[PDB]
Amino acid sequence: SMNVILSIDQSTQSTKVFFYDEELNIVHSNNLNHEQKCLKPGWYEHDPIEIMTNLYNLMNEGIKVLKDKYTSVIIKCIGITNQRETVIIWDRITGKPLYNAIVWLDTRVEELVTEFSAKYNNNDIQKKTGTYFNTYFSAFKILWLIQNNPEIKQKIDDGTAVIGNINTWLIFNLTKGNCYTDVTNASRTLLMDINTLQWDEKMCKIFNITNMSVLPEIKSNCSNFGLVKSEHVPDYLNIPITGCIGDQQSACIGQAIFDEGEAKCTYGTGVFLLINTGEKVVYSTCGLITTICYKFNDNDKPKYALEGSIGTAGSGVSWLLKNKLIDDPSEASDIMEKCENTTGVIFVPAFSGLYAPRWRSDARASIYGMTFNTERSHIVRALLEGIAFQLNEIVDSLTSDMGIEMLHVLRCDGGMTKNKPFMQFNSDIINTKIEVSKYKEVTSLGAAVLAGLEVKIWDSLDSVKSLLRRSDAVFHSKMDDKKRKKKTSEWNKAVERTLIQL
Amino acid sequence: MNVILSIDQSTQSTKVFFYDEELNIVHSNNLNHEQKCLKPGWYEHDPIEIMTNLYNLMNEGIKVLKDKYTSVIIKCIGITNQRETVIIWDRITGKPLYNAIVWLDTRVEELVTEFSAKYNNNDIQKKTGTYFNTYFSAFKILWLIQNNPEIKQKIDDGTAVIGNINTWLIFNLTKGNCYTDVTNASRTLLMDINTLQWDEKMCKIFNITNMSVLPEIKSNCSNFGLVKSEHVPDYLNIPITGCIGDQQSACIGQAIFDEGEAKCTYGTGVFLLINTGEKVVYSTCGLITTICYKFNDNDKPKYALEGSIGTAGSGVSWLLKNKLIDDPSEASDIMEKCENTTGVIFVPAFSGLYAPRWRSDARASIYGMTFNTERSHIVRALLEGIAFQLNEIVDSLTSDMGIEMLHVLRCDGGMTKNKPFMQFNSDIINTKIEVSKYKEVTSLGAAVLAGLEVKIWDSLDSVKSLLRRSDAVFHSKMDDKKRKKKTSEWNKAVERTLIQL
């Protein structure tokens, strides 16, 4: 008889389910991809019903498998984590989406952001929310929906719509109607006051959200999110949803970066570096976003973070695969062993613009330096190198904002962290010691932690921390400052070529 | 069955055509050879592979004809070839001292920069018809001299032969004749464009200390020798009677004989030539002054201005190698199905930019991609890039010729069958395009030269009617505002590619 924690990670490219035992070993896991719809230049959508169907199927297969291995199974609780910013507006009473999800990676609102940015003081927006206007957060997507679909406008006005991130969507469906979010996801909307942790009336007005009742209640990360009641997942009847957090913040909890100054970097569909700033709100002057790291309980002061976001990483590799430049993602290590340099090819991976720290939504993905000798392999390597170069820019902003000369370690996680030549190149270019987590799925691990803590599986966070801090690999820089400066100059000139106004 | 053998030793393959005396193709076949691109900038061919392929093609074709006809007589052989590509070999043994270094090779970029600084570039243009560049033979010869002491020593002692592909073919087929023709000699950077002789000052600049290693320059219709190679026994004592570089051959095959007439061939590269009559025209807009043809020794040559584009078919081949297209065949459907490029621009500068900008520092670059971009958009961008480059050349040509517009551009090549591609071309270059009826006008040109030399026909005037036949005309369907926009978008991309940072 087996107690387990279900951790759902509804990620950008796929939905993942993880069943953890109470020693935080994975006893079953699986995933299903869902369509990445890119209809037009800059558009990026998901089908919200496809996501739910995939979720239900994965939950049902998982309990079946477990009930096959074990004598009885007890699901103690459910934690939810998710791709952030992605937004769905749906009908409250029926649950019917009024439009597809518009994903974080969508950039159709470039024109709107240019328009609004000229009308508002960017420092005032940043003080309120933690960010300048951008194409990335939910708010301009919501605005676009309201401007382009009068049904949406009408139903926000009359309070018959719900505006939600993916976490809100999942909980609403599982619970048959609860409307909740958590402070980490709310901080990704451009609608929350970053200091007070409440929906901000002024921001709502800017974005034409005329009836704030359509917004879900903002909860702490460990909370009573409700009981599963969906008839699609009958074995899960009355199992409580007890933790909820945005994916990249989830990875902070899974990496145990709980002390001020500790930093992690997750390599996934995008790459996301967060540093814990303790209870102090730190506002960047270098292109980083101020966000909520976590707030476990209602009476806790939140821990804050500075975040550097990169949009093209795994999403780039996926693009390469679709367009036949790579036969399979698994090859990327072998490609980097065999292909020792790119023969000066540079790939500025800007398919959805540049995010942190330059924030140029007018950037597009660009390849430079090719000759007849250039092969697929070199193009693939150059895209991977471009991840590292972008991360280096982020690290430079972070050290400036933090008033430090270096990070002592960067804790890293993700599939790509198993690719030794890639991680070595990252360590070389960012000039930072990198410690790779033992767990790669640290996102799902953080959600299982929060859910378990909420139902007292363990007494305290302190009983799980030594477990969490485990590492299996370390990288140090092996690259000369001469060589590094030369490579970073090459990158910098290719970014200039990509950005110059002509 | 009396036939003319026309050999087209092209960049990517070797083709043989047997023509009857009415210029009908009775048999043809081809074989590819390796495009060796070992390092960035490097582009080589195996000279022995080319010869082996040609002998197999010749032997198979005469087997086919003698299976089909009761008696076969090969009246004569014409040779045409990829230009600029150079091979240095031992005179006695015929052994190559190094691979062919192809016209597309750009390893000499640093030397060209050095020499362009040291010498007066207008003087080089006045002498030879071109500025220093990575394209013509001479820098490649100089690189071999500087990097291979055996080549240096065999030039100095007069035991090597320095030859373009025509010279190489004729040397092997004849067991030793060392000949070139006027058109190929003009592609070396070593010939005086006015006197049509090897220039001692040029040879000095390129460290060619002994001019005896260079072949005799002949007219295009000439006695190039009799076939003697034991590898092609059935061809024993058949005369080789025409020889011309490929792009010039396409001039003959398109009947571009009058002053101001122009053609454009689409192949591995794209090459526009305009006949300037007996006048030598020096460009101020990046075009090269070349010889169009000189049939007999007595004739004043006909000159041309030429705009050369490196990445065309060579670009398609790269796309194919890198899995961005599954077969070349698909370009048309790609362009039908793909009505625009998602705003993507591909500056196809794998070996730098050739005419009219002549920037050896340029590299192939792709701009404007989003997650919506697909292979097909990138393919179509490369193809659009051909047309944008052609437009720049047409602009240079109308300036140099002192005209407002070309009346018509006669086009040939496999790409010219692709209606959406040709229509894009005609839109962007804003020039009427007339497509030749004949698909291998390069080989036709050599067949005409070879057969004229052995007097198969009364005159060139008898064959001209057949040569002029066209089957399609394109005119621009694009409005000036949309043309100006697109050309502005290309120009900004090129500027991004070229800005010195």
Residue numbers in the entry:
A (entry chain C): 0 to 501
B (entry chain A): 1 to 501
Which passages does the manuscript contain on this structure?
GK catalyses the rate-limiting step of glycerol utilization, with phosphorylation serving to sequester the sugar in the cell. The 501-residue GK polypeptide is arranged as two domains separated by a deep cleft. Each domain is constructed around a βββαβαβα core that is characteristic of the sugar kinase/Hsp70/actin superfamily of proteins. In agreement with gel filtration experiments (data not shown), PfGK is a dimer in the crystal.
The crystal structure of PfGK in complex with glycerol was solved by molecular replacement using EcGK as a search model. The structure was refined against data extending to 1.5 Å spacing to give a final model that agrees well with the X-ray terms. Glycerol is defined by electron density deep in the cavity between the domains. Its hydroxyl groups fulfil their hydrogen bonding potential through charge–dipole interactions with Glu84, Arg83 and Asp246 and dipole–dipole interactions with Arg83, Tyr135 and Gln247. The C3-OH of the glycerol forms hydrogen bonds to two water molecules that occupy a narrow channel to the protein surface. The apolar face of the glycerol moiety packs against the side-chains of Trp103 and Phe271, the latter representing the only glycerol-binding residue contributed by domain II. The pattern of interactions is similar to that in glycerol complexes of bacterial GKs. Residue Tyr354, whose hydrophobic nature is conserved among eukaryotic GK sequences, occludes the alternate conformer of Tyr135 in the closed form of the enzyme. In PfGK, the β11-β12 loop (residues 227–238) corresponding to the glycine-rich loop in EcGK is well defined in the electron density maps. In contrast to the exposure of these loops in EcGK, in PfGK this loop is oriented towards the core of the dimer, an orientation that would sterically hinder tetramer formation.
